[PDB]
């Protein structure tokens, strides 16, 4: 009975609903996506603060945080995958997080015929269902409902 | 591998209020014509009481849940309707299938159109009337001019227009004389005849073009308990013209199609029949109470 | 046609003719097109019921203009013979107009009935 | 309660209760074990409530 | 980007922000025939004299906001350029009439609203004889 | 004694026991519908006018001055549109729209004299039928007894109202929803305009003059 | 497990039969039309109408006269009449 | 009956004119805003005997005219009931002096 | 109740109006020789069945309900042949049906007479 | 929610309020949701809810 512990309950402001979330591997970074905003919280073993996001404001459906806690990748409006670097600056009180302006990465133009793109539900099966980083975050991949898998690599300085 | 079983996560279940397929039925083709219906996107939309509208894929028996679009707090979903155009043909004989648009009501005066590409609500339309309780899309006989008919609390059958990516309150066909008549279910017999159930023990049969009234079918008291007014919770229409209606007594009534009188009363349930379904060839009726 | 606030539902038609018969026994009723026009012009009329089975339909079409000017509700029943022997006349009555007073169960019925006519409109 | 012992259903009658009504049937059993004219039925009801 | 504007007098075209060309007219009883011709979407001499160029279609575009007029002038084979309907073109056909004071020194340096009044009276009395008295 | 009111183009006449509203007659020596006139000023009757019931109620602005452009939606037989034409003067012009044929008859027989109005007998739910006839306006007045009144105002304002324009709309609760509270009906209509990209500045009831009628004065995109 | 059955003839020829099989689990299965289902290798899908009221086995099932009603009786000491 | 009808028409016209003049003498308005900030800004902007005598006079005139019209309408209804009581055949309508309501269910042949 | 009934002219059947008004009246039809239910004819009205009459050949029956709806209901096909309306009847009270050499598929009776609650009796 | 109106005694100054529902869904009317339930449970009573508990 003492093993588990109902530790935290984070309430989101507004009226929207949490579409997705993600947490860093050490649990100090949490990110939750509504279809209006993408909110990011910093945690200290609790004590929770809200990291100020900028540049977003149209919501997302999937959110992933890198295993080295440097990349925050979401799926704005379902189909537009975006990513942002977060800069971690240590101080005398502890660590603090500044999230950069979201740098949208472009997805590959697949060859789909015009009658298929007009009929059916339209461009419905473009929205990415999974967002998966590698274990060392040198490589991103996303995947949608049509069966398309699009991957990205990291080119450093 | 060591396992901690955990049942203390009280995930909330939410009541399903509206189930709506994309196509009600596809035309039967052979095995040599199997390649014609391969790109037809058949999806199932299920709207829960917490406002979650979530698309399923039947997948030839796979049933994969694809997208969940949640609504906000204090927001529910009551009715779901897909609007599927007929098959357009190109210049070369290729087939453009029907673009399917999803419409919903949320116990409000507003019909919402959902954008499944952007995974949010696309449009809102509302007129000066009561809260919409039931609605449906007019069936095909016109081609590009299809219209939604919506019943409501205070009575007035409002009629919305949908063409060329639009959803606007066109007009109001009629309203009942009694203000206490609440429209609870709606189903179309043909292109121009709308069958509505009401709360004051009636099944009215309006005619959409002139907005007139063909006949007022009626049902008696409920003699099982109190509350004399029977409530026709679900009407639907057979392909040969008859009308099947489940009501507050748990009955299922079969109404004649040409005369609009009842032909049969089938006492089936104990509590009230809440939803009906009719097979595409008109051979089986499913009733859920 | 020109009879656009038509009462087609037989339950509402039966309610209208039952209230007409009750007002006829209360002597709160004006029968005929000329007497209906006089009651609507004088403003004593609470509700006015025309009939759509009139063979020249244009002989009762002036009453919708005066009811639009005086804001009283008018409604069309199907059968003028039914309206006639609902009033208790033994003739065909094409327009009838039932009036109001201070305090009556009939006046409460009139208020509910014109609410149902406003639901038709 | 004698009819519910004769028709085999006293366990079914007692098994679906909640806290306040268990307290009510216990209060009846305590109040009416005293009369030896229905001590048997009252003790049987108390057996099933203990079990 | 040929746009098709119809005022009570004449037409204007703003293809290249700024206005490109026009067509003016005044004070005739064939103005009500022009009015009925755009009540339906029939053949119109001012329309044809506007859309008659000699080269070819050079880009298939003509922005007209009413779909009825668009797919009634689609069928004319005199120039075989195909128009486009109102794809929620509120901004174009609202801004040109609100900023139409810039246009007035161009084609008709005047105030032409008296024939607008005359056409209004003519159409309204035509419908009052359509409901004859 | 006649003074001009706070609203330009509107006059009041004051006496020892009365205070009346009036306008400056564009056709002197002529009356329209049997109205008293003072020497030439026509007395505006708030019991037959929706707009004159707003001005005596505390309407802060009416958005129109002499020389403006007003589109009148629902011109019932030329009662208030004559006073609106006399407000806007000769350099202004009022575009009357009325679907009903008898009021169209009386509207055109009124509109023959006053040349600054143009009458259009067309359904107000179809703006592309008089898109040729109506230029850009400054003010939309709207007194139409249809349940999609905000939708009619919406399509006519997307096709004819200027950027930053004016809207004076008269809402009828017993026309839109006769069972709900009129405060709730009026709040839903204000919210429909607000999502229809107006900016509601004020709302006032017409209730020494009419029963369950509101007047919403709002601006368009500013 | 079949406890009883009653067959009624649908007619001076014999057009069809309607079989009511009262089973030992309590149900009464009404097979509506049999000679027109087994007259025609291949047969169409036949599916009895189930009428379940008796708890124990149903002792006797009979059609009644005109064929509107299905009268029945089991261990529960009750003559039941299915309106049908 | 004809005299009472003419006097009722005159008195109804007087009541309509007097009620129009009384309304012309003397949750109503709803203003919408996008947000709580704009609502509070408009609330900051909101923070920044002869009529009584003449309106009481018109109110007393309106009440007396309503009394006169109600009296003439009751007189016209009583005279229509007198016609029903004195018809050449048995006609329904009106109460007897015992209180029992007259209702004959015969048809006028 | 069993108060209102009609025995067929052939003597084989007997119809009893079931006391269940509720906006439409039914009548249960009983074989005379065995006194057992064999059919049921339901018409829609406001207060039920005013009266009814067997046809002269003995098969069907004509059921005149209140509020004017009259219904010919056959015994062979055991469903409604047709529905018509009495002229201007605000409510029917009685009906009778007689004569010979009528229509062969409507029982062979020539005249139908329907009397309403106002006092007017129509003969068709 | 919305700020409540302030009346001077004659006029009422009120903030407009439509900031509740941006793009999410409109909030369900609790008076209408309880009415449809009251048509479903007319005179009928609930069965006793749980097990052995106060």
mmCIF file of N, CA, C and O in Angstrom, chain H residues 40-81:
data_model
loop_
_atom_site.group_PDB
_atom_site.id
_atom_site.type_symbol
_atom_site.label_atom_id
_atom_site.label_comp_id
_atom_site.label_asym_id
_atom_site.label_seq_id
_atom_site.Cartn_x
_atom_site.Cartn_y
_atom_site.Cartn_z
ATOM 1 N N UNK H 40 -13.922 44.170 -19.256
ATOM 2 C CA UNK H 40 -13.500 45.030 -18.159
ATOM 3 C C UNK H 40 -13.077 46.415 -18.640
ATOM 4 O O UNK H 40 -13.253 47.387 -17.903
ATOM 5 N N UNK H 41 -12.543 46.534 -19.867
ATOM 6 C CA UNK H 41 -12.248 47.866 -20.404
ATOM 7 C C UNK H 41 -13.521 48.669 -20.624
ATOM 8 O O UNK H 41 -13.571 49.862 -20.297
ATOM 9 N N UNK H 42 -14.566 48.029 -21.160
ATOM 10 C CA UNK H 42 -15.849 48.717 -21.287
ATOM 11 C C UNK H 42 -16.458 49.032 -19.925
ATOM 12 O O UNK H 42 -17.181 50.024 -19.785
ATOM 13 N N UNK H 43 -16.143 48.235 -18.903
ATOM 14 C CA UNK H 43 -16.613 48.564 -17.559
ATOM 15 C C UNK H 43 -15.840 49.741 -16.955
ATOM 16 O O UNK H 43 -16.410 50.530 -16.193
ATOM 17 N N UNK H 44 -14.554 49.891 -17.298
ATOM 18 C CA UNK H 44 -13.840 51.126 -16.959
ATOM 19 C C UNK H 44 -14.454 52.335 -17.650
ATOM 20 O O UNK H 44 -14.583 53.407 -17.043
ATOM 21 N N UNK H 45 -14.821 52.186 -18.925
ATOM 22 C CA UNK H 45 -15.431 53.301 -19.645
ATOM 23 C C UNK H 45 -16.815 53.629 -19.092
ATOM 24 O O UNK H 45 -17.247 54.786 -19.133
ATOM 25 N N UNK H 46 -17.519 52.628 -18.567
ATOM 26 C CA UNK H 46 -18.784 52.896 -17.896
ATOM 27 C C UNK H 46 -18.586 53.540 -16.533
ATOM 28 O O UNK H 46 -19.418 54.353 -16.120
ATOM 29 N N UNK H 47 -17.511 53.186 -15.824
ATOM 30 C CA UNK H 47 -17.160 53.876 -14.591
ATOM 31 C C UNK H 47 -16.750 55.321 -14.829
ATOM 32 O O UNK H 47 -16.959 56.165 -13.951
ATOM 33 N N UNK H 48 -16.176 55.625 -15.988
ATOM 34 C CA UNK H 48 -15.848 57.003 -16.332
ATOM 35 C C UNK H 48 -17.086 57.741 -16.835
ATOM 36 O O UNK H 48 -17.620 58.614 -16.151
ATOM 37 N N UNK H 49 -39.379 65.516 -12.723
ATOM 38 C CA UNK H 49 -40.633 65.740 -12.015
ATOM 39 C C UNK H 49 -41.751 66.045 -13.004
ATOM 40 O O UNK H 49 -42.897 65.610 -12.824
ATOM 41 N N UNK H 50 -41.396 66.807 -14.042
ATOM 42 C CA UNK H 50 -42.320 67.087 -15.138
ATOM 43 C C UNK H 50 -42.733 65.802 -15.844
ATOM 44 O O UNK H 50 -43.927 65.563 -16.081
ATOM 45 N N UNK H 51 -41.750 64.956 -16.161
ATOM 46 C CA UNK H 51 -42.024 63.664 -16.776
ATOM 47 C C UNK H 51 -42.809 62.751 -15.848
ATOM 48 O O UNK H 51 -43.661 61.995 -16.315
ATOM 49 N N UNK H 52 -42.578 62.849 -14.536
ATOM 50 C CA UNK H 52 -43.319 62.030 -13.586
ATOM 51 C C UNK H 52 -44.789 62.420 -13.543
ATOM 52 O O UNK H 52 -45.667 61.545 -13.576
ATOM 53 N N UNK H 53 -45.070 63.727 -13.511
ATOM 54 C CA UNK H 53 -46.452 64.195 -13.514
ATOM 55 C C UNK H 53 -47.159 63.830 -14.816
ATOM 56 O O UNK H 53 -48.282 63.309 -14.791
ATOM 57 N N UNK H 54 -46.504 64.044 -15.962
ATOM 58 C CA UNK H 54 -47.214 63.814 -17.219
ATOM 59 C C UNK H 54 -47.326 62.319 -17.527
ATOM 60 O O UNK H 54 -48.301 61.879 -18.153
ATOM 61 N N UNK H 55 -46.403 61.495 -17.026
ATOM 62 C CA UNK H 55 -46.516 60.062 -17.245
ATOM 63 C C UNK H 55 -47.537 59.433 -16.310
ATOM 64 O O UNK H 55 -48.246 58.507 -16.715
ATOM 65 N N UNK H 56 -47.661 59.940 -15.076
ATOM 66 C CA UNK H 56 -48.753 59.498 -14.214
ATOM 67 C C UNK H 56 -50.102 59.913 -14.785
ATOM 68 O O UNK H 56 -51.088 59.170 -14.681
ATOM 69 N N UNK H 57 -50.146 61.076 -15.439
ATOM 70 C CA UNK H 57 -51.377 61.530 -16.076
ATOM 71 C C UNK H 57 -51.768 60.647 -17.256
ATOM 72 O O UNK H 57 -52.933 60.238 -17.374
ATOM 73 N N UNK H 58 -50.806 60.331 -18.133
ATOM 74 C CA UNK H 58 -51.087 59.429 -19.245
ATOM 75 C C UNK H 58 -51.409 58.019 -18.771
ATOM 76 O O UNK H 58 -52.215 57.332 -19.403
ATOM 77 N N UNK H 59 -50.830 57.589 -17.648
ATOM 78 C CA UNK H 59 -51.149 56.276 -17.104
ATOM 79 C C UNK H 59 -52.582 56.220 -16.595
ATOM 80 O O UNK H 59 -53.279 55.223 -16.815
ATOM 81 N N UNK H 60 -53.041 57.285 -15.932
ATOM 82 C CA UNK H 60 -54.432 57.317 -15.481
ATOM 83 C C UNK H 60 -55.397 57.377 -16.659
ATOM 84 O O UNK H 60 -56.465 56.746 -16.630
ATOM 85 N N UNK H 61 -55.016 58.095 -17.724
ATOM 86 C CA UNK H 61 -55.834 58.113 -18.937
ATOM 87 C C UNK H 61 -55.907 56.735 -19.587
ATOM 88 O O UNK H 61 -56.975 56.327 -20.064
ATOM 89 N N UNK H 62 -54.791 56.003 -19.594
ATOM 90 C CA UNK H 62 -54.752 54.667 -20.188
ATOM 91 C C UNK H 62 -55.621 53.699 -19.394
ATOM 92 O O UNK H 62 -56.371 52.899 -19.967
ATOM 93 N N UNK H 63 -55.571 53.789 -18.058
ATOM 94 C CA UNK H 63 -56.400 52.900 -17.244
ATOM 95 C C UNK H 63 -57.886 53.205 -17.399
ATOM 96 O O UNK H 63 -58.700 52.272 -17.459
ATOM 97 N N UNK H 64 -58.259 54.484 -17.512
ATOM 98 C CA UNK H 64 -59.668 54.808 -17.714
ATOM 99 C C UNK H 64 -60.155 54.374 -19.095
ATOM 100 O O UNK H 64 -61.294 53.908 -19.238
ATOM 101 N N UNK H 65 -59.301 54.490 -20.117
ATOM 102 C CA UNK H 65 -59.692 54.026 -21.445
ATOM 103 C C UNK H 65 -59.820 52.510 -21.508
ATOM 104 O O UNK H 65 -60.708 51.994 -22.198
ATOM 105 N N UNK H 66 -58.969 51.787 -20.776
ATOM 106 C CA UNK H 66 -59.096 50.334 -20.720
ATOM 107 C C UNK H 66 -60.362 49.911 -19.993
ATOM 108 O O UNK H 66 -61.007 48.932 -20.388
ATOM 109 N N UNK H 67 -60.737 50.635 -18.930
ATOM 110 C CA UNK H 67 -61.996 50.353 -18.246
ATOM 111 C C UNK H 67 -63.188 50.586 -19.164
ATOM 112 O O UNK H 67 -64.133 49.785 -19.177
ATOM 113 N N UNK H 68 -63.147 51.662 -19.957
ATOM 114 C CA UNK H 68 -64.247 51.952 -20.874
ATOM 115 C C UNK H 68 -64.365 50.896 -21.967
ATOM 116 O O UNK H 68 -65.478 50.462 -22.303
ATOM 117 N N UNK H 69 -63.232 50.442 -22.509
ATOM 118 C CA UNK H 69 -63.287 49.421 -23.550
ATOM 119 C C UNK H 69 -63.747 48.078 -22.996
ATOM 120 O O UNK H 69 -64.507 47.362 -23.657
ATOM 121 N N UNK H 70 -63.319 47.728 -21.777
ATOM 122 C CA UNK H 70 -63.760 46.474 -21.171
ATOM 123 C C UNK H 70 -65.254 46.501 -20.866
ATOM 124 O O UNK H 70 -65.945 45.492 -21.049
ATOM 125 N N UNK H 71 -65.777 47.664 -20.460
ATOM 126 C CA UNK H 71 -67.211 47.787 -20.215
ATOM 127 C C UNK H 71 -68.017 47.655 -21.501
ATOM 128 O O UNK H 71 -69.041 46.959 -21.527
ATOM 129 N N UNK H 72 -67.562 48.288 -22.587
ATOM 130 C CA UNK H 72 -68.288 48.166 -23.850
ATOM 131 C C UNK H 72 -68.182 46.766 -24.445
ATOM 132 O O UNK H 72 -69.133 46.290 -25.076
ATOM 133 N N UNK H 73 -67.055 46.080 -24.236
ATOM 134 C CA UNK H 73 -66.923 44.717 -24.737
ATOM 135 C C UNK H 73 -67.816 43.756 -23.965
ATOM 136 O O UNK H 73 -68.423 42.853 -24.560
ATOM 137 N N UNK H 74 -67.924 43.944 -22.645
ATOM 138 C CA UNK H 74 -68.861 43.143 -21.866
ATOM 139 C C UNK H 74 -70.305 43.426 -22.251
ATOM 140 O O UNK H 74 -71.131 42.507 -22.260
ATOM 141 N N UNK H 75 -70.617 44.676 -22.611
ATOM 142 C CA UNK H 75 -71.968 44.997 -23.068
ATOM 143 C C UNK H 75 -72.287 44.334 -24.402
ATOM 144 O O UNK H 75 -73.397 43.824 -24.594
ATOM 145 N N UNK H 76 -71.324 44.319 -25.329
ATOM 146 C CA UNK H 76 -71.561 43.670 -26.618
ATOM 147 C C UNK H 76 -71.701 42.161 -26.470
ATOM 148 O O UNK H 76 -72.529 41.539 -27.151
ATOM 149 N N UNK H 77 -70.933 41.556 -25.559
ATOM 150 C CA UNK H 77 -71.091 40.125 -25.324
ATOM 151 C C UNK H 77 -72.425 39.799 -24.671
ATOM 152 O O UNK H 77 -73.051 38.790 -25.024
ATOM 153 N N UNK H 78 -72.879 40.640 -23.735
ATOM 154 C CA UNK H 78 -74.182 40.420 -23.117
ATOM 155 C C UNK H 78 -75.304 40.560 -24.129
ATOM 156 O O UNK H 78 -76.275 39.803 -24.084
ATOM 157 N N UNK H 79 -75.170 41.479 -25.087
ATOM 158 C CA UNK H 79 -76.215 41.619 -26.096
ATOM 159 C C UNK H 79 -76.210 40.469 -27.096
ATOM 160 O O UNK H 79 -77.278 40.074 -27.585
ATOM 161 N N UNK H 80 -75.038 39.908 -27.408
ATOM 162 C CA UNK H 80 -75.016 38.712 -28.249
ATOM 163 C C UNK H 80 -75.641 37.523 -27.530
ATOM 164 O O UNK H 80 -76.347 36.711 -28.148
ATOM 165 N N UNK H 81 -75.426 37.422 -26.215
ATOM 166 C CA UNK H 81 -76.110 36.383 -25.452
ATOM 167 C C UNK H 81 -77.613 36.622 -25.376
ATOM 168 O O UNK H 81 -78.381 35.659 -25.332
#
